[PDB]
Amino acid sequence: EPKREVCELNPDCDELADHIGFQEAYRRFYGPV
């Protein structure tokens, strides 16, 4: 699953996903622009 693949690498994205899940963490880190 590509979102988890990208986010789980990045320590800050993965840490956020620990709290709010990969969909929300990915949207926060890689959504804008």
Features of this protein?
33 residues, mainly alpha, Osteocalcin, structural protein, Ca-binding protein, monomeric
What does this structure look like?
The PDB classes it as structural protein. The entry lists the keywords Ca-binding protein, structural protein. The assembly is monomeric. The entry is titled "Crystal structure of decarboxylated osteocalcin at pH 8.5". The chain has one domain. The protein is built from three helices and no strands. It has helices spanning 2-9, 11-20, 22-30. It starts with a helix and ends with a helix. The relative contact order is 0.25.
Task: Write a concise synopsis of the structure shown.
The chain has one domain (1-33).
Strand content: under 5%
Q: What would the principal axes of the Cα set say about the shape? A: globular
Question: Domains counted in the coordinates: how many?
Answer: 1
Structural class: mainly alpha
* Helix-strand pattern: HHH
Task: Write down the Rg.
Answer: 8 Å
Approximately how much helix is present in the residues? over 70%
Oligomer: monomer
How far is the N terminus from the C terminus?
22 Å
What is the count of DSSP helices, taking H or I runs of 4+ residues? Answer: 3
Let me know the number of strands: 0
Biggest β-sheet: count, sense, barrel? none
Modified residues (4-carboxyglutamate): 1, 5, 8
Binding site for Ca(2+) 3: 8, 14
Disulfide bonds: 7-13
Family: Belongs to the osteocalcin/matrix Gla protein family.
